[PDB]
Write a protein that binds this ligand. Structure first.
Ligand SMILES: Cc1noc(C)c1-c1ccc2c(c1)nc([C@@H]1CCCC(=O)N1c1cccc(C(C)(C)C)c1)n2[C@H]1CC[C@@H](NC(=O)OC(C)(C)C)CC1
Length: 114
């Protein structure tokens, strides 16, 4: 049974790795705002929105008990973006860049956590 400070120390470097991907992480730093973006169908398509600010806040305040719940949220944000956006769009290709980065950093940390 993990403690939320153990979880934060080990997983937060993987989250900071995402934030550094400038400009790729910019669309993902805050919730998608469908009104601002003019995309009224977004919450029809994305039933469980997620973004970097929400994951950071959940990490910071201890809302994850096990590491796979953090991993699930990160992949939720990618899958939402791959689902809603066309393959030709910048955010789609941005999402693939951050997903590539993420797999690269999450593997060793998950194996030392377990
Ligand atoms: C993910 C995802 N999944 O589906 C969807 C849908 C998203 C998603 C999400 C956001 C998005 C977005 C797509 N396209 C944009 C803008 C909007 C115009 C069109 C465009 O080409 N863009 C764009 C895309 C890729 C890269 C960038 C940079 C690198 C220039 C920044 C821009 N943005 C925000 C819109 C406003 C955000 N600023 C903000 O919220 O400011 C406050 C003060 C916090 C409210 C920052 C980028």
């Amino acid at each position: 049974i993990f403690k939320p400070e153990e979880l934060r120390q080990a997983l937060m470097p993987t989250l900071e790795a995402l934030y550094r991907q400038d400009p790729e992480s910019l669309p993902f730093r805050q919730p998608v705002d469908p009104q601002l973006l003019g995309i009224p169908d977004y919450f029809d398509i994305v039933k469980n929105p997620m973004d970097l600010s929400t994951i950071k806040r959940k990490l910071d305040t201890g809302q994850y008990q096990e590491p796979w719940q953090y991993v699930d949220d990160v992949w939720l944000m990618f899958n939402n973006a791959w689902l809603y956006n066309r393959k030709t769009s910048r955010v789609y290709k941005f999402c693939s860049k951050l997903a590539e980065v993420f797999e690269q950093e999450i593997d060793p940390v998950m194996q030392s956590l377990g």
